[PDB]
Amino acid sequence: KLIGHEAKLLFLKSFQFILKRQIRWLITEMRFPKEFEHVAKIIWLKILKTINDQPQEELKLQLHMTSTISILYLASTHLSLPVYTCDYIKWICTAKMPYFQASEILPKSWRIQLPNYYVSILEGSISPFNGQLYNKIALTCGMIHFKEFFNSEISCQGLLLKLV
DNA sequence: TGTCTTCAACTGCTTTCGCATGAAGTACCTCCCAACTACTTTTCCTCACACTTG
């Protein structure tokens, strides 16, 4: 229950946390050591860097339901473990991600922090339409300047195998 | 003009001494309160049309 800059800071924070919860199920899910974990962490560290700069009263960050998986997606590609469609279907099928419902938090309290303008608009709003999902990845790459930072992006002779 | 006589209406009382065990007048209006559903609210997000090229 707070509006403005600090409302945003915790909106920020909550976004912070669920992604982390997302990542660890990621590790249990695939089991691809420190590596998957730390690359994902700095990726968002890098994402955060940008958010602070256009701060003042910049509230454009309200990253979407898709922003988080785009993050995990790009981090995975850096590593280049899998694929997108496969990942998405697997995730929906097993709810592997905490993606669809945002009640997890650890907030009970973050919830009450008045999901207000933001945190309420977090965790599970709706399912991806048309490019309502590849477009975000591009935006993340732009903010990220991801291609310079990470090697071999979108690759995978494994998607071909998956497909045949 | 004067005195006597009756009847009926009204006054006042008819154990003491303690526990009990207190309750209860109050109508007209109400604003507040509690409610169900619908509607509205704040912040955020993402795409779209057009113009110009050859």
Side-chain angles (χ1 to χ4, degrees), chain A residues 96-115:
Chain A
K96 293 179 179 179
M97 299 296 180
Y99 180 77
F100 59 88
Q101 297 177 335
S103 69
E104 165 47 307
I105 325 329
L106 195 327
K108 69 177 172 61
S109 315
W110 291 95
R111 298 179 67 247
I112 303 177
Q113 294 300 320
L114 177 63

Side-chain angles (χ1 to χ4, degrees), chain A residues 1-2 4-34:
Chain A
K1 54 192 193 196
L2 189 147
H5 188 279
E6 295 85 357
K8 291 174 65 175
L9 289 174
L10 295 174
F11 178 80
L12 194 147
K13 291 174 65 175
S14 64
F15 178 80
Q16 297 177 335
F17 172 72
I18 191 66
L19 165 49
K20 183 190 183 69
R21 181 62 57 90
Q22 188 173 355
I23 51 99
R24 182 170 294 107
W25 182 88
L26 297 174
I27 308 176
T28 50
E29 183 280 335
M30 302 242 97
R31 284 193 297 274
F32 296 97
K34 293 174 65 175

Side-chain angles (χ1 to χ4, degrees), chain A residues 5-80 82-127:
Chain A
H5 188 279
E6 295 85 357
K8 291 174 65 175
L9 289 174
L10 295 174
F11 178 80
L12 194 147
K13 291 174 65 175
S14 64
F15 178 80
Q16 297 177 335
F17 172 72
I18 191 66
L19 165 49
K20 183 190 183 69
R21 181 62 57 90
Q22 188 173 355
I23 51 99
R24 182 170 294 107
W25 182 88
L26 297 174
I27 308 176
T28 50
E29 183 280 335
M30 302 242 97
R31 284 193 297 274
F32 296 97
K34 293 174 65 175
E35 322 303 12
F36 191 137
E37 184 280 335
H38 296 83
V39 172
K41 190 200 306 186
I42 67 100
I43 286 175
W44 178 255
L45 286 171
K46 294 188 71 173
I47 292 164
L48 293 165
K49 173 45 187 176
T50 292
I51 296 189
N52 272 4
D53 306 0
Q54 6 58 70
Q56 324 107 13
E57 84 326 340
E58 116 69 353
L59 329 298
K60 148 71 208 70
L61 1 298
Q62 185 64 60
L63 284 53
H64 182 62
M65 43 191 169
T66 320
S67 64
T68 293
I69 185 167
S70 299
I71 294 169
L72 175 162
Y73 167 89
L74 275 66
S76 171
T77 61
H78 182 197
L79 188 172
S80 323
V83 45
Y84 176 77
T85 189
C86 152
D87 152 39
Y88 170 99
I89 185 183
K90 166 220 334 310
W91 152 66
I92 277 305
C93 193
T94 67
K96 293 179 179 179
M97 299 296 180
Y99 180 77
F100 59 88
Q101 297 177 335
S103 69
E104 165 47 307
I105 325 329
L106 195 327
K108 69 177 172 61
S109 315
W110 291 95
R111 298 179 67 247
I112 303 177
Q113 294 300 320
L114 177 63
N116 205 326
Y117 67 89
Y118 63 105
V119 175
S120 63
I121 209 199
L122 298 199
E123 291 310 315
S125 73
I126 193 66
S127 302

